[PDB]
Amino acid sequence: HPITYYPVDTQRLVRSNAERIRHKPYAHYFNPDVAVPEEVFAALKAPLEPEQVLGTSSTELNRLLEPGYLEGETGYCGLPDGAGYTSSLVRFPGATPEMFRWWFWWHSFEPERYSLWHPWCHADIWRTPETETAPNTDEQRYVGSTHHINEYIGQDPLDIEITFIDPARWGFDADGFAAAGIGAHACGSVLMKGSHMRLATMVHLARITDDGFELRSRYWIGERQAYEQLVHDQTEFNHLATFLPDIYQE
Amino acid sequence: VHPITYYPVDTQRLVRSNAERIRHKPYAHYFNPDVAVPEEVFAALKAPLEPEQVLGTSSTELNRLLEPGYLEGETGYCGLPDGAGYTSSLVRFPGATPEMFRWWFWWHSFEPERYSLWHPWCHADIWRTDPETEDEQRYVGSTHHINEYIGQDPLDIEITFIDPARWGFDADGFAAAGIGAHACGSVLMKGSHMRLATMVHLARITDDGFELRSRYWIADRAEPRHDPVAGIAQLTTVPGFSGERQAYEQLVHDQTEFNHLATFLPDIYQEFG
Amino acid sequence: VHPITYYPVDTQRLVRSNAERIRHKPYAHYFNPDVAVPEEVFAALKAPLEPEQVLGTSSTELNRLLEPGYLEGETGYCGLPDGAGYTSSLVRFPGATPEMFRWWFWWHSFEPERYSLWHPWCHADIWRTDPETETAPNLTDEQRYVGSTHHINEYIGQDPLDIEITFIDPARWGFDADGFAAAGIGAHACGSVLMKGSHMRLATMVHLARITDDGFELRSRYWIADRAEPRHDPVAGIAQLTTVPGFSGERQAYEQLVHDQTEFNHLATFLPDIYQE
Amino acid sequence: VHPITYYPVDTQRLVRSNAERIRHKPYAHYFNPDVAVPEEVFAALKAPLEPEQVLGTSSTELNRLLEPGYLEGETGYCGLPDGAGYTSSLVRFPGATPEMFRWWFWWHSFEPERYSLWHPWCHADIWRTSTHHINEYIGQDPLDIEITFIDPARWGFDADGFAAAGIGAHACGSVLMKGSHMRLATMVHLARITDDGFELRSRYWIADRAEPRHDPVAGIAQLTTVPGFSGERQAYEQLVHDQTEFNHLATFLPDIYQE
Ligand SMILES: CC(=O)c1c(O)cc(O)cc1O
């Protein structure tokens, strides 16, 4: 189902994104059409129950390594204090997790590449560039790096910084990833520019499936922010799934 | 289910050693110390079986396990007249298949850490003389050399699995009876070779998955369809040994670890089978 | 709460003989074999206390129990350096008053069947040689057990034990007994637990009932197989229990923890009713 | 956090007598001799502030304490030109509120045992007939002092700006010696609201010439005239004293305020 709500400022951004990407060789992947799968619609209408929230203890994070699904794979809710939580499953048919690793460095070296991923919300990305072409591993081209991002989440533009970390630092059983079909990850702290206020802890796990892979994402963020993040994640990662294999191939 | 409320002091140390050494194993996240037993077996924890409810070891008696439905005393324990003991234990495995049980019974035996997943508190060690052997052929005929707690103290035991036909089971009739897996064998004390148990595990297909029906004849006089082993004493001759108490320990032990296994067997089979 | 999942085989017989014996007693309807322990003590059943969490038996250490709030390791067990053991156990008695506890500690002691109410699985027998004390006029609740010796047969583990408990004035051990009321301590049951015959020390035992808004809380301490009664010399001629072949202070302390949590939580379920009746 | 490594010998005796005195008081539970200092002030313990880091006592200077954020030298000590001393001290009170601090500054004053909780080692006596007549150690020797608290505006603080500046409590006073009336300190305690509770920003002008917005008192010499007296040393003693007793109060103020 096509998205029915486009914040006014993103309506401007999609047009300026379209214009500046015109003559890039990956321009033909730029497509504003965004939609969310019928399977997630209920999650758009009702918050998760506190018995569907995953904790951040070593034990709870490693439950994601279990085959099959946990409760509340896709949804959002407010938490104790004004904190927030977001969960989101997105399927990537015809893709492999290696493509997800490659994507998470490749997009980060040009704002126009970043804009492919969410034409409406992605305004700017920068990194402080030798890493793109340094001789010799996909993970080594973004893990341990900081992505400076300017994007819309909801109506609000944000200026944030994401540093990607070895999942082991959070107590993930990294040695168990391969057996569990987890071929990619992207985990990090989301911090505000300047203030360095923590905004979210974020996990993205790419797990091999029969059809390709599936992306399982968790955000520990207020209640509003978690809802915007749910919409954001479903929108941009479903969008990425429509061209990731083709753009990886090319 | 109700959490276990009693953890012998030595096992409290073992569960921590086990947690430590299993770090960085690919199956580490299946290590979970939380153990419990289902409400439906609580009566069996509180009173022994009656003599009438004890299954014998003749071919006729063993083959009653192939009958549809259930027998008297599917779960319980009691002492037997010669100081021996008896344990029966039914454990449900929703979402699993007998194939998974067959797999588990060889796979776990090649690393102590795998063995520890099954009973985090009580399983200390396992080895076999044929590590080359890495479903039935992969554990039947094999001996598992085990160190584990079944009560307060660590035991060194040797479990050799056999073809159930050797004991008079209608092995041909297993398929028709819904028995898709079996693990039957003798449990001997390391060193003395004294018989700790004749042991039967039968996995019967159910609508939800399968159910494990287990029988143990503790400190018995002889392997089924055999003479007692000449020159080796019955375990009941050991001063201070109680077959009744040991049967109770085995009941608690079986219910604890096989219910534990039921909570992750389908998943770990998917990952590693 | 969570139901007990382990019943030693001899106690499975005992609960049945206890049920039979108590029939036609006036208090028979208080007999209930169902036993359970609170979620909050489960961590204590799974790992020992650290040595820093262990209270000593010096007067200064004992009187720490009068401090408001809690100490480290209110519930737990551990082994001690030279074969001895230690048990602490906190049990809540919602809806009860310390007076009921003083009453209970004499009232149960004059009939084995009353004693069986308390731990249906483990309590086999009790006797005292001053039966007159039960009905003597004008005695306080405390006067009816402090100074008395209870001869007890019970399970604290797999096997029956014959023990003798003599209840003392806590002042004898250096407790600021005159300061109990100010500290909200409304009842006590303290004494030495000795083995029948040998008179070896099985435990130095402290039970303090401290007033709460909900009722009271029972704070218990056991120093298992220790060498002397507090403020007293070791008794000449009698070996420490740790000298017995096969005795484990550590294991005994674990049994005492399970035993205390089981029976005092059980007592909490009916103490206010039986006191009322 | 690091335990104090230095206990003057008289205070070793005093923490004991305090321990005995308080035994059967309702609040005896809050008596704890353990005292420590946060890692962050350790630099302040090893070198004096520079002159540029000293706050003055004019209305504009005092009101700089209302400015958001921090000033130069939030924690430290130094000697001043006329032989006087200066102490600044920031102490965090996580879990607490300014109202608790207000409550404390009158509550403690009516029983010597209550005052004892605050600094177990140095606090010996207090009474009233506000003016607090105190016996305590701020150094090696027992001092008989008289602390009288005033309305901040009398020193020229922007009282109407306190709320907007997060200042939920204050305790400003003159500290005088018993008998001689010599001036030991001009003292300011400001409790500023923070995310985790509040922070106490203290300023002392030690052995100073005059109360703010006052002349010196006629016929009474400045304490800097006493033969063996050093404003510099006293300011260091006051820094240690302030960091010790206020970090200590922080460990039990919310609890004791509840009770
Ligand atoms: C009896 C028991 O504890 C047991 C068992 O029934 C099967 C097995 O493969 C290993 C074991 O240690």
From Swiss-Prot, chain C:
Hydrolysis of both phloretin and MAPG is competitively inhibited by DAPG. The lineage of its organism: Bacteria, Bacillati, Actinomycetota, Actinomycetes, Mycobacteriales. InterPro entries: DAPG_hydrolase (IPR041526). Its cofactor is Zn(2+). This is Phloretin hydrolase. The keyword Hydrolase applies. The keyword Acetylation does not apply. Its EC number is 3.7.1.4. Changing E154A: Abolishes activity towards phloretin. Changing I152A: Abolishes activity towards phloretin. Belongs to the DAPG/phloretin hydrolase family. Changing Q256F: Abolishes activity towards phloretin. Homodimer.
